């Protein structure tokens, strides 16, 4: 229940950090 | 902070003075007494059960109904005071809470709002902080309203009996025969057959 919401929150944070790194490492 | 012994016994005797007021305005005595009086009026027998009999019945019913509240007061407030664990002030404050909860359980929000608005009290968050000076009149008014509701509802079967006997007498042409004389024995029979006394006391207890 709440644990799944916390896990999805962690997944979104990790994905956004990944995308931010990729954005500058791409050019 | 603990009151000296002479002040304690002064408070105790002065509080014992206010006993009938507490019984009438804080317990379930008033509603039972009003319902009993209305029921006695409803049977057409204005003085059949003597006032003392009904008063004793109401007192015993009130004691039985308020036994859980008295037990809570004893366990939480009076017992530590009797073992010198807590002072009289904090014992009284702790004993107020169960009685306050019982009275709040049997009050109507509209009357509480009326007395709060009348007394110019500030906004109160939840039922936890409502002064006793506000709760007591609201509880008394709610008890009066509930007692009148119960009495008016009780008045119905005897009204049915009176109407049916009056119609039966009238359809026979008996123009000058009063229906009260014929209705009173049948009212007694109706109340006896349905086990009226114990049923009504059980209904009064269940409503609390």
């Amino acid at each position: 229940d709440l644990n799944d919401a916390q896990l999805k929150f962690a997944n979104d944070v990790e994905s956004r950090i990944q995308r931010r790194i990729e954005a500058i490492l791409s050019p | 902070q603990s009151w000296s012994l002479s002040v304690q016994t002064l408070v105790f005797i002065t509080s014992l003075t206010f006993l009938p007021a507490i019984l009438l305005m804080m317990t379930s005595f008033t509603r039972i007494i009003i319902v009993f009086g209305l029921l006695r009026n409803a049977l057409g027998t204005p003085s059949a059960p003597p006032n003392q009999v009904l008063l004793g019945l109401a007192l015993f019913l009130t004691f039985f109904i308020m036994s859980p509240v008295i037990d809570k007061i004893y366990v939480d407030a009076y017992q530590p005071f009797s073992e010198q664990k807590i002072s009289m002030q904090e014992a009284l404050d702790k004993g107020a809470q169960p009685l306050r909860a019982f009275m709040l359980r049997q009050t109507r929000e509209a009357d509480l709002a009326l007395f709060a608005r009348l007394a110019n009290s500030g906004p109160l968050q939840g039922p936890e902080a409502v002064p006793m000076r506000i709760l007591l009149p609201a509880y008394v008014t709610s008890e009066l309203k509930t007692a009148f509701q119960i009495g008016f509802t009780i008045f119905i079967p005897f009204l049915i009996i009176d109407l049916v006997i009056a119609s039966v007498l009238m359809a026979l042409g008996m123009m000058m025969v009063p229906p009260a004389t014929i209705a009173l024995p049948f009212k007694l029979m109706l109340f006896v057959l349905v086990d009226g006394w114990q049923l009504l006391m059980g209904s009064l207890a269940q409503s609390f």
């Binding site: - | 929000e109 509209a110 709002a113 009326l114 709060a116 608005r117 500030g122 906004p123």
Partner: protein, 111 residues
């Protein structure tokens, strides 16, 4: 219209009597607002809060006014002010700041 009230029954209760009074007021106010040069049609909604009791410092009413203007007839600041004054006065204890004035395009003319 105030007419609505004149043509009425006798079985109507107090609630009905009040609602009818509110409607009539809404009508007349819209009427005067339209009778202002730049205004082609007006629509007034009143929210008059009922008796207090359960409340403390009581509360005050609110109004929403929608105006349709004549092609290009923009309302001046003073106009907006006058609409505010009229609507506020017509409602017992209506604090101007609780009057919203809006045009046919959804622009808030007041605040």
């Amino acid at each position: 219209g105030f007419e609505l009230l004149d043509q009425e029954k006798f079985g109507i209760s107090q609630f009905s009597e009040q609602v009818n009074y509110q409607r009539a007021l809404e009508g007349e106010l819209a009427r005067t607002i339209e009778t202002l040069g730049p205004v082609k049609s007006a629509r007034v909604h009143l929210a008059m809060p009922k008796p207090s009791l359960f409340v403390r410092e009581q509360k005050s009413p609110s109004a929403s006014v929608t105006v349709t203007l004549e092609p290009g007839r923009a309302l001046d600041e003073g106009q907006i002010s006058a609409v505010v004054h009229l609507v506020s006065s017509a409602v017992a204890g209506l604090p101007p700041g609780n009057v919203t004035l809006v045009d046919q395009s959804g622009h808030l003319l007041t605040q």
